[PDB]
Subunit: 102 residues, 3 copies
């Protein structure tokens, strides 16, 4: 399995996106939590309060998921970061696989 | 070293497990923080407030830690996610190795 | 690219250090959020509130970033954990590369 990390400007946009992904079976679970983002933007550093989203799904769904996220994300150029999970307990993997599309 | 990520239903169960893993020195450190989980639960999309736990330990203790977490975890099917650390400052690593069981 | 995870004792230090890293063009973005740390220290399990920081930058800047963080961090032995990003949307990578020093 893999985790995909992306961030949102608020809870409504974040929840809408994750629920849409769940409905479309592109991810099995999402963990959302707030954070303060500090970053470079057009010549100056910006500070925004965001909602980070840790998505859990299959490596086989990475490409499809990445493209779907692009279509749904409020940011024109959002962060869609893939970090592979080296290993996970068999019972959880079984669940994640059953809950996601082939 | 590796990072192990798992979620708990509340702060009480989270702290209990983490303190036990620490006492038994299966991990050297844990970072807990709340988040909102969204997932499929046998036919429907559920939402739950959880406490996520980021555990820091060594590769060699993965199997034993995974098994111990299974025994202590409040969920019958918990998420026990292993993500290897590609690199870390040598003095922190020495500390982590020294604090965990050999 | 890579994500670097480090923790701070408070927001003052967390913000000062991440902004310095941003201004020295060693990272493009940083996501900070509080968490509760539980860890072994000199024979006792300590507990402390911390500000965790997720830094995003180029793989090529790892060593410089690691050394710079060591030189700026309030902790004598901080956690400087590097986790490689297996893949990311090219549009974001383009921006990240453009915002970090060459
Ligand atoms: Cl996190
Ligand atoms: Na990896």
């Amino acid at each position: 399995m893999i985790i995909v990390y992306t961030t949102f400007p608020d809870w409504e946009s974040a929840e809408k996106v994750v629920k849409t992904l769940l409905k479309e079976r592109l991810i099995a679970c999402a963990n959302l939590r707030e954070h303060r983002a500090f970053y470079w933007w057009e010549g100056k550093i910006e500070e925004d309060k965001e909602v980070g989203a840790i998505l859990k799904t299959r490596e086989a769904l990475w490409e499809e998921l990445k493209e779907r996220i692009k279509e749904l994300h409020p940011y024109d150029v959002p962060a869609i970061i893939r970090i592979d999970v080296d290993d996970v307990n068999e019972d959880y993997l079984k669940w994640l696989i059953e809950e996601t599309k082939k």
